[PDB]
Design an enzyme around this catalytic site. Structure first.
Site, mmCIF file in Angstrom:
data_model
loop_
_atom_site.group_PDB
_atom_site.id
_atom_site.type_symbol
_atom_site.label_atom_id
_atom_site.label_comp_id
_atom_site.label_asym_id
_atom_site.label_seq_id
_atom_site.Cartn_x
_atom_site.Cartn_y
_atom_site.Cartn_z
ATOM 1 N N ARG B 75 0.848 -1.182 0.000
ATOM 2 C CA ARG B 75 0.000 0.000 0.000
ATOM 3 C C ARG B 75 0.889 1.239 0.000
ATOM 4 O O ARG B 75 1.672 1.449 0.933
ATOM 5 C CB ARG B 75 -0.941 0.005 1.206
ATOM 6 C CG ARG B 75 -2.056 1.021 1.091
ATOM 7 C CD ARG B 75 -2.791 1.242 2.399
ATOM 8 N NE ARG B 75 -3.406 2.565 2.415
ATOM 9 C CZ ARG B 75 -3.434 3.371 3.468
ATOM 10 N NH1 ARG B 75 -2.915 3.007 4.628
ATOM 11 N NH2 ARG B 75 -3.997 4.571 3.353
ATOM 12 N N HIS B 119 -3.355 11.171 0.652
ATOM 13 C CA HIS B 119 -2.774 10.876 1.955
ATOM 14 C C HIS B 119 -2.203 12.145 2.574
ATOM 15 O O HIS B 119 -1.032 12.215 2.949
ATOM 16 C CB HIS B 119 -1.730 9.772 1.823
ATOM 17 C CG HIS B 119 -1.516 8.973 3.075
ATOM 18 N ND1 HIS B 119 -1.331 9.556 4.313
ATOM 19 C CD2 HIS B 119 -1.478 7.635 3.281
ATOM 20 C CE1 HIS B 119 -1.164 8.611 5.221
ATOM 21 N NE2 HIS B 119 -1.254 7.436 4.622
ATOM 22 N N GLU B 165 -7.843 8.444 6.252
ATOM 23 C CA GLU B 165 -7.999 9.044 7.580
ATOM 24 C C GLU B 165 -8.506 10.481 7.488
ATOM 25 O O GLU B 165 -7.913 11.419 8.031
ATOM 26 C CB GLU B 165 -6.689 8.972 8.365
ATOM 27 C CG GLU B 165 -6.096 7.577 8.422
ATOM 28 C CD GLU B 165 -5.232 7.358 9.652
ATOM 29 O OE1 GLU B 165 -4.965 8.345 10.368
ATOM 30 O OE2 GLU B 165 -4.840 6.200 9.916
ATOM 31 N N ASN B 294 -7.899 1.521 9.508
ATOM 32 C CA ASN B 294 -6.620 1.832 10.138
ATOM 33 C C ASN B 294 -6.843 1.697 11.637
ATOM 34 O O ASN B 294 -7.549 2.514 12.240
ATOM 35 C CB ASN B 294 -6.139 3.232 9.761
ATOM 36 C CG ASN B 294 -5.784 3.353 8.277
ATOM 37 O OD1 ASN B 294 -5.806 2.369 7.538
ATOM 38 N ND2 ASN B 294 -5.433 4.563 7.846
ATOM 39 N N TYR B 296 -5.215 1.149 15.498
ATOM 40 C CA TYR B 296 -4.103 1.189 16.434
ATOM 41 C C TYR B 296 -4.539 0.971 17.873
ATOM 42 O O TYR B 296 -3.814 0.331 18.637
ATOM 43 C CB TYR B 296 -3.369 2.536 16.305
ATOM 44 C CG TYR B 296 -2.669 2.712 14.981
ATOM 45 C CD1 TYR B 296 -1.396 2.206 14.772
ATOM 46 C CD2 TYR B 296 -3.299 3.369 13.927
ATOM 47 C CE1 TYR B 296 -0.759 2.358 13.551
ATOM 48 C CE2 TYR B 296 -2.672 3.527 12.704
ATOM 49 C CZ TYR B 296 -1.399 3.024 12.523
ATOM 50 O OH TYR B 296 -0.769 3.177 11.307
ATOM 51 N N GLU B 373 -3.985 -0.338 7.766
ATOM 52 C CA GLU B 373 -2.885 0.058 8.644
ATOM 53 C C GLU B 373 -3.054 -0.600 10.005
ATOM 54 O O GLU B 373 -4.149 -0.567 10.576
ATOM 55 C CB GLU B 373 -2.817 1.577 8.841
ATOM 56 C CG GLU B 373 -2.320 2.381 7.659
ATOM 57 C CD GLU B 373 -2.273 3.868 7.952
ATOM 58 O OE1 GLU B 373 -2.282 4.235 9.148
ATOM 59 O OE2 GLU B 373 -2.252 4.671 6.994
#
Lengths: 475, 472
Positions: B75, B119, B165, B294, B296, B373
């Site tokens: 990616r 991005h 995002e 994504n 985390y 991600e």
């Protein structure tokens, strides 16, 4: 500030069910229901209580409606006894039974009370159990539909609001998992297969409703306990996720989307418990989308991680002895836990008015349908005072707090169309007897003595009377 | 548990400004971050992406390491100002040839390219001209830039990401002022997001015409919300947090509509975006093939009074325990989860939360899911034998991949998993000391050194994961 008024035509209501109030169990050609039978089994009901007489509402319905008019009710939710209409469940209709609910409806309309007619409130004709096992046979789809269409034709010009199935999840769980309801079974495979047939009968009846009552509004009334996690530990969150999927989305996805939630369905398939989907099932289920979701709300439930060797069955509090209710769960999925931050009733039902607001928002956010609170109330012991009054301030406190959170949910943006308290008069609690009272109107009887069945307005009657007069301005 | 799918996309990810460098070469226009990183105090120790890790010139070396790892997917992000130096003028062929040679390099090694359209590197010219995403003119210019990429690479690239995002980037851009354009205004935040939603949908609508066999979706910065306790007030806070931080973007991406509860609140506050004629019809045209996730950390929330917590300082130094709580007064506030461990940047380690979040999106929306991600950013050291024993990184990735197997077993339609990141790279606000890579890069905040590529222990661990298809 935040004391915004309720909508002008908000349906201020109260509710009952046929078996719990009507009595006259074997009169004017009525056929047996599964509860006429089940309540006679030793040990199934509190102190042998039954609905043979109940509060005699079949003969005394005019006195009760006059109390509803004195109250100023904008809506009254009642159910129709299927075996009073079809004593054998199918075939020949009982005109005496059709005439009773026809007179009830006209009495309500005379006082500008909106009827809210519940089609199925657990009183399957015993003849259909005898003939083919009730909801365990797909024959019930056609027979339930024919019963519903009979009522749609005769009453549909006058009745706008209809409820299809009442608390399918709760009724079928006790019927096929705990055996506390008829048919008294403990089998998870049968539970999911009977639920599947009930979904099919619900969708068929609603599809018919679109043709016979095109100006009417219909929905199921779901027994709704929003799930809470016990803590922010991820294992407790995952238990809450599982509880929400298995106890709420299983019915709500099917009622509103016409499909089963994928995560529970895949799990049931591996355990061998999944319902069998036959040809044409998904096409029928897609036709059952409702106009509103009926919400029967009493408490939230808090959940925590449950090991594979963990809790499953547990004994329910049916005596009013506080703290006697036992925890339950699905091993490997979740287990209930008493919420430490909530008061409870003497029957261990948690008092969580903010949970109503949370639950209304969740259904509104996920499915985007109008909501109708078809049940909400507090079951408690009542005493009659020396002066003849019932000072049920505990019941007022409960109803006030929940109505405050209904206002806030309306402020939040939920399309709440009305609110029906449970119950209008005291009535038979299926498993808890007459001593667990919910009414605005006290009925003088106990478990085995009917006494005089006198109607006495409780203090909560006058409080709610004033709520309606002020369109919810005062409490 | 069921094995990972047969064609499961074992991937790794990067972003253009964080790796490419060559900020003023081959006619590349100035990005919004080229200017922003020069402002004192905006980046850690003045770090910037002028050089980054020089992936622009050293891309064949980097791709050679992906082939050694056996990556099934890679990616990457395309720099908009490299294709259109002014944003909306003529295209720079040198930029189109670079990503042409990069894609060709990837397919030569049997690596599936996953192209991220945007991005965060908006060309500075569009900010100067009409203010970027605060003008509806960007809908046409972003579509024109996307369409140009659809024609050149649409035959070779099947997997695309539209907006990366949008929530995280725009929040730091218009709420906290930690990203460009350095704004602190709620109304501007929701207006700019609304135009971004329209740009996203326009780009996806065009994708269906020019790339009919491809798959496209947004990459959402996804932190599933937890309640701190079974107190009803804390459950209500969690409900608010999920609607405002997650459903606001996820409902729009998947349903084409804003969630009713946040919308009514924002209208009363005067912060809601203006919905013009044509908006809802366009937005209904942007349904994605997959939701890019994504992930985390999870975030835990509790009740917040009207006079309660709002802004808070973020940990950009790697000093544990310096991140402050934030929230929306009267709605919710964050609270450090007492049941979770955190990294040195105060990011919570919650692998089960990934399973929970995958299930939630799957349940609510019914769309395929692509983890675009997931990784651990931490300090790395190079031992005396030239190795990097980043066993903390392995432990993090192992736990999350175990929960991915559980989510797949549960029934979630997970199509792939891209680690962040493949090589070390510039963290926008945390500098080069916060390292996520499988491949170490010898450089620091102010010194480029030799930009040497050194494989970490996690490199060989992930190599083995792919070879065994996640069995080990």
């Amino acid at each position: 500030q935040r004391l915004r008024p309720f909508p002008d035509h908000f349906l201020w209501g109260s509710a009952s069910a046929a078996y719990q109030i009507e009595g006259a169990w074997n009169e004017d050609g009525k056929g047996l229901s599964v509860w006429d039978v089940f309540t006679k089994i030793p040990g199934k009901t509190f102190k042998g209580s039954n609905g043979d007489i109940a509060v005699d509402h079949y003969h005394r319905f005019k006195e009760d409606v006059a109390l509803m008019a004195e109250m100023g009710l904008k809506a009254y939710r009642f159910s129709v006894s299927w075996p009073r209409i079809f004593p054998q469940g199918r075939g020949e209709a009982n005109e005496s039974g059709l005439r009773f609910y026809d007179d009830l409806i006209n009495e309500l309309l005379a006082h500008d009370i909106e009827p809210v007619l519940t089609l199925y409130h657990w009183d399957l004709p015993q003849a259909l159990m005898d003939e083919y096992g009730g909801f365990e046979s797909r024959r019930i789809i056609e027979d339930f539909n024919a019963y519903c269409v009979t009522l749609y034709k005769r009453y549909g010009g006058r009745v706008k609001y209809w409820v299809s199935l009442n608390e399918q999840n709760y009724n079928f769980n006790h019927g096929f998992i705990t055996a506390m309801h008829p048919p008294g079974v403990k089998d998870r495979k049968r539970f999911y297969e009977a639920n599947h047939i009930a979904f099919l009968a619900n969708a068929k009846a609603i599809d018919s409703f679109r043709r016979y009552v095109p100006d009417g509004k219909i929905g199921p009334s779901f027994a709704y306990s929003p799930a809470y996690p016990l803590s922010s530990r991820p294992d407790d969150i995952l238990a809450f996720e599982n509880a929400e999927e298995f106890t709420n989305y299983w019915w709500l996805d099917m009622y509103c989307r016409g499909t089963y939630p994928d995560i529970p369905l895949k799990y049931l398939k591996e355990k061998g418990w999944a319902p069998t989907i036959e040809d044409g099932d998904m096409e029928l289920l897609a036709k059952g989308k409702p106009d509103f979701v009926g919400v029967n709300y009493y408490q939230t439930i808090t959940y925590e991680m449950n090991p594979l060797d963990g809790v499953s069955e547990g004994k329910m509090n049916t005596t009013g002895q506080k703290g006697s209710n036992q925890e339950t769960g699905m091993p490997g999925l979740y287990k209930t836990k008493r919420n430490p931050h909530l008061e409870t009733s003497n029957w261990d039902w948690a008092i969580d008015p903010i949970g109503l607001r949370i639950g209304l928002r969740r259904i509104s956010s996920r499915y985007g349908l109008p909501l109708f609170i078809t049940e909400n109330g507090l079951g408690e012991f009542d005493k009659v005072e020396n002066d003849g009054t019932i000072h049920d301030d505990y019941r007022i406190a409960y109803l006030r707090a929940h109505l405050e959170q209904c206002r806030q949910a309306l402020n939040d943006g939920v399309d709440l169309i009305g609110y029906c308290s449970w119950s209008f008069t005291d009535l038979l609690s299926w498993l808890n007897g007459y001593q667990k009272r919910y009414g605005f109107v006290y009925i003088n009887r106990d478990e085995e003595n009917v006494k005089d069945l006198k109607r006495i307005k409780k203090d909560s009657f006058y409080w709610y009377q004033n709520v309606i007069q002020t369109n919810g301005e005062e409490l």
